[PDB]
Every structure is written in C-alpha cells, then in structure tokens.
Design a protein around this ligand. Sequence first.
Ligand SMILES: CC(=O)N[C@@H]1[C@@H](O[C@@H]2OC(C(=O)O)=C[C@H](O)[C@H]2O)[C@@H](OS(=O)(=O)O)[C@@H](COS(=O)(=O)O)O[C@H]1O
Ligand SMILES: [Ca+2]
Length: 474
Amino acid sequence: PKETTIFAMHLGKALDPNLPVFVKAEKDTNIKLVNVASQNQTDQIQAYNLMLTEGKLPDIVSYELSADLENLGIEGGLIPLEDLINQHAPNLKKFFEENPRYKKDAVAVDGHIYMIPNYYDYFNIKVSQGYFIRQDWLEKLGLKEPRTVDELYTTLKAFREKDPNGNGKKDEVPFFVRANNVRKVLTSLVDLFKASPIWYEENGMVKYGPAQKEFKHAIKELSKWYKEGLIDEEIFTRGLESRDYLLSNNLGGATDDWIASTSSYNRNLADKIPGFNLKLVLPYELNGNAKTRHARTTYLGGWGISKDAKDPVSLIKYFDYWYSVEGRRLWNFGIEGSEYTLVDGKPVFTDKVLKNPDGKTPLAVLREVGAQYRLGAFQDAQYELGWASESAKAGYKYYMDNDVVLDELPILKYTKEKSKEFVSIDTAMRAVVEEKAQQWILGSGDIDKEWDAYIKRLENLGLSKAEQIQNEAF
Ligand SMILES: CC(=O)N[C@@H]1[C@@H](O[C@@H]2OC(C(=O)O)=C[C@H](O)[C@H]2O)[C@@H](OS(=O)(=O)O)[C@@H](COS(=O)(=O)O)O[C@H]1O
Ligand SMILES: [Ca+2]
C-alpha cells in the first residue's frame, strides 16, 4: 500500500476510498487513496478553490471543470502526462490511438495533456435527457399525447385541474425537473421552448443562449405556466430528490430528464402506483422546430497528477489501471458476485442493482458501491444498456432515428490568459441570468419591460468579449 492523496468530489459527495469499487482497485493497484476533500464538503467548486490555497497540492487532482485543470497545468501545478503515458500507460496509449476525438479532448492548447477526462461512451450513446409524460394520466383523462408546446400547455393544465391521481385533491405537479443548481433548473425548463441557458453552436458560430430571443420567449411562457401551477411551485428549491419524491407520491405528470434513470420508475413503482406509465416522447415542436439541445458532451471533468506527487510513474499506472479491461469493468459495473455476475463472459447485473428493494434506481445502487464515480475513466455504454429498461433502450434509438438531438459543443479550451478573461465575464453573466430568470419565472418584475435593460446589462459585463473568446476556441 502507498498512501496517495487525492482531491475528489462528485455529485456533492467527497470520494470515500473504502467504497467497494475503490477497495477492489486498491487491492489490484496497491494505491491507497486518502481524500483531502472532507465528507462534509458538498460544493465541489468551492472545495476545489479552497484546496488550491491550502499549501501542497494532493498527489492527484480531480475536478469537474477541465479548464481549471488545464490552467493549473499551465501554471505548473499539474504535470504533463503524455510522455508518462507513452512509457508506462499502455491502455491509455492504446485508447488515444483508437479514439482521435478523445485524444484531442485531452490535449491543452499548449500541446500538453494535463488531465485524463472522464469520458462518456459518446460514440455509442450521446443522447442524454428526454421528455417524459404520464401516459396513464393521458389515458385516464382521454387526452392525446401532446406534440406541440401549445398542446403540452393544454395537457399540463388538464393535469393540474382534473385530479388524474384520483384522490380528490388539487395536488398534481404537472411539470417538474431534477437539479442541484439554478443553471440545471433552467436547462430542463427552457429547452422546451428551444432556448438554452449556456453557450451553444449555431452553424459553426458560438452564441450565448441567455441573450437570444428564444430565451426571452421561454422565460415569458414559464412565468405564465408557473403562475398557473403547471410548473412545480418548489422548482428552484428542491434538490436531486425531486424526481423520487414527485413520482413515488404520484404527484408528477411530466419532466425532462436522463432517459435510462427516468425510464426505471415504471418497474420501480409498478406496485405502489398500479398502471404508472412515465413514457418517453419526442421533444415537443415549437413553430416547426422539433429539436432538443439535450446531449452528452464527450467528457465531464477529469483528473491529473500534481507537481507535488513524489511517484508520478506509479500514479500514471494507477490512471492506466482504469483503462484495462478489468479496471474499466470495475469502474462501470461495480463488484463481481455483488452488482453483476459474468454470464457468457460479460457482466449481467443482479437483482441488487436491477430490482433494489428500497426502490432505488439501478444507477443509484451502482453509485452507492462507488461505480460511475467521475474521475478520469471511460464509461462503457454496455453498463447503461445493462440496466436500462427495454423502453429506455428503444428510446435511445427513437431519439437517434428521428434526428431530434442537436450535438453539444465540444468542451472548449483556452490559454490560461484567455480562460481568466472568459471566466471573469462568464461567471458574472451567469449570476445575472440566474437572478433575473428566477425573478421573472417567480412572477416579480416583467420580462417585457426589463429585457432590453438585462441585455445591456450582459453587454456591459463583456458579452461580446466572451463571444470572441468562445469563437476563437471553437
Ligand atoms: C459522468 C456523470 O456522472 N454524469 C452524471 C449523470 O450520470 C448519468 O446518469 C444516467 C441516467 O440518469 O440515466 C445515465 C448515465 O450513464 C450517467 O453517466 C447524472 O447523474 S445522476 O446519477 O442522475 O445523478 C447527472 C445528474 O445531474 S443532473 O440531474 O443535475 O443532470 O450528473 C451527471 O454528472
Ligand atoms: Ca389529485
């Protein structure tokens, strides 16, 4: 065993190296992680920024924001990995040969690799969230499946007014989302209206979604729907438990959320709510547009080796372990004999994952054992196919075949100087967007009177300078 310090968090939770997956990795690698993030920290961004101030860097630095990792590397806080990989990491070396896009994702603008991304299995599943509705409530109310945003409005109003859960109470929550910050609330609300709260691509050009006319229209409509009780009153204040809470209590009528986990509730709730059918639909059309911008990026965050690590060779071998057949299987599937067994040589999940007795989704079970824990690993779509229901599996194909998903932006890279300029604009604009969007949706103020002042407000923070940086990076 080697004590190896790490800064690692994901989904609000510091890595516990005694989770089943990491106990197995420790046994296979002789690397014993010790986390410098503590079990009480939940805000990964603030924990990371604080961690940079605390003297020596941990041996391994994992982080959800890859530009900050490349900046740390340009400053000399993380070391270049590409020669270590060449000499000592045959699995990563092979992976970079077989995957040009992923290799390009790992190279900073100065030509060094400062981090190994945590890659989605992007070329096998790139769809992410999809639109779902209570087909059993549609049938109960004799309603057609809505296809346009206007039809969705009519349906959600019916869900609010007509007691589809049959209890004589006006408790229905027609539309809800699942989010742990305001940006992610907006993400699952404004895409209905073909708007975006982030930067996106239009024909090779990068634009800022909150400055676009579609966003104004999205906020105006959401304001109306919120006043009429069509949108969850508590939309900005629930955490990630919203979906479990609203579905298991038979309150939620419709959502926009990840396809496999959201599809898991039909089987999960089949006994507590007879006939529960939360069904995938294609994105609703608005003025001829049937597209969704919900898509995976090629990766999310990454991890690197700091200049303070006394044995960087043994750490790149640790990084490489996760790209071996057994390491990548462990990271994705959990523990052989517990989460899965090998059937005809390939993992098949057990009832512990597929039919959890407390009603956890399969993914929530896997996260409990330390699987899918974002670091610098390569997700295997065979794991997602392993637990996805038949209707989730058909639904990836339904979204792909109908061509409704717009590809996400590549993760953009910067020099350290351009990153510093961009974030001082981008983070300030973010705060304005989130302040005004909540204010407008919650019904204070008036977007029509206020829009032009808001746009000017973004411009005065440097909107056009950030637009220039984003287009140079793309
Ligand atoms: C790389 C990573 O961990 N991504 C998180 C998402 O995990 C995906 O979730 C699902 C699914 O829900 O069907 C399928 C993919 O295999 C997973 O990589 C997801 O995590 S979570 O388990 O739902 O919490 C999102 C959730 O955050 S959100 O509701 O705010 O989008 O977080 C991504 O980190
Ligand atoms: Ca009711």
